[PDB]
Design a protein around this ligand. Structure first.
Ligand SMILES: *[C@@H]1O[C@H](CO)[C@@H](O[C@@H]2O[C@H](CO)[C@@H](O[C@@H]3O[C@H](CO)[C@@H](O)[C@H](O)[C@@H]3O)[C@H](O)[C@H]2NC(C)=O)[C@H](O)[C@H]1NC(C)=O
Lengths: 48, 48, 96, 49, 48
């Protein structure tokens, strides 16, 4: 399970991090357009 | 880029928020015009 | 930096240099970082194997190392199709 | 052929295109099926399988 | 209660100036410089 927190907000991000690194996954944050390309390609490191 | 050493090189700027409309700008570590670094700058900021 | 000669070649409709390998770094990735400079330090040993492979089989086309840090070192050296901002156009190429 | 594989019908909105943006061109591979390169036939499907 | 006359004067001045502006600048701020053949307003980095 890979979880992505997108945008700027005041909502709690703890539960999605727990989902990420509980089911052998990873947690990513995408605050703007500039981070989309870098953060949507890093999941191949965990898969390798 | 959260540090002066990271804030180097160039980055993409998306005008009107469109991911397909790109423009290149250099990264520069900027300092606020009104700050609180010393007592004089703090006094100027508080006067403003 | 390095200034190559860039002779004209067949099997490459471009100008290539067989003396070293070219390095492509994504535009938004700052070259000169500790991560990037370290990669360029130890990837300089691939040029000898590039030359050995080319001399063993002269029909080889591009052979490239795609780094996990975004770098791309390919042989033979050749100017990139799209400069950063020399023309009005830019490039969006990440080896990853 | 060296041309990229076309998908759908191309639609453009020329009223929302700045002249100095360098929009991305393409990154997809040229994946053409055997049945899409010739006239598809029942025997040809069997041969391909 | 004593501020009643002042409020009346304020409303009176506001009405007069609104009517004057209506007759002077009606339908005048409706042209801006778009790009060639597009519906995109042309501005610079820090200009509204
Ligand atoms: C990455 O960069 C480092 C530093 O430039 C390279 O290390 C350098 O390797 C050369 C080749 O062995 C060293 O030259 C030798 O130095 C010894 C004395 O240390 C001398 O006795 C030999 O005759 C020869 O001149 C050089 O000193 C060394 N530099 C440092 C600072 O240790 C390294 O080779 C680079 N990586 C790759 C893959 O090329």
């Amino acid at each position: 399970v890979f979880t992505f927190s997108v945008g700027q907000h005041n909502y709690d991000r703890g539960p999605i991090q727990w989902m990420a690194c509980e089911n052998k996954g990873y947690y990513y944050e995408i605050p703007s357009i500039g981070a989309i390309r870098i953060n949507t390609q890093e999941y191949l490191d965990v898969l390798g | 880029k959260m540090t002066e050493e990271e804030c180097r090189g160039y980055y993409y700027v998306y005008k009107d928020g469109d991911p397909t409309q790109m423009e290149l700008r250099p990264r520069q570590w900027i300092h606020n015009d009104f700050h609180f670094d010393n007592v004089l700058s703090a006094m100027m900021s508080l006067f403003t | 930096r390095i200034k190559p000669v860039f002779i004209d070649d067949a099997n490459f409709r471009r100008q290539v240099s067989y003396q070293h390998a070219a390095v492509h770094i994504p535009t938004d990735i700052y070259e000169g970082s500790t991560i990037v400079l370290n990669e360029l330090n130890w990837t300089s040993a691939l040029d000898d194997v590039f030359k050995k492979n080319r001399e063993e089989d002269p029909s080889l086309l591009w052979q490239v190392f795609g780094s996990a840090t975004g770098l791309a070192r390919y042989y033979p050296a050749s100017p990139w199709v799209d400069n950063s901002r020399t023309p009005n156009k830019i490039d969006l190429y990440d080896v990853r | 052929q060296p041309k990229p594989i076309g998908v759908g019908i191309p639609t453009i909105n020329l009223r929302k295109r700045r002249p100095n943006v360098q929009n991305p061109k393409s990154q997809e591979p040229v994946t053409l099926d055997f049945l899409d390169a010739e006239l598809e036939n029942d025997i040809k499907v069997e041969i391909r399988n | 209660l004593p501020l009643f006359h002042i409020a009346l004067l304020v409303l009176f001045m506001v009405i007069i100036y609104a009517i004057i502006g209506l007759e002077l600048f009606k339908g005048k701020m409706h042209k801006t410089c778009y790009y060639i053949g597009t519906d995109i307003v042309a501005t610079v980095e820090n200009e509204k």
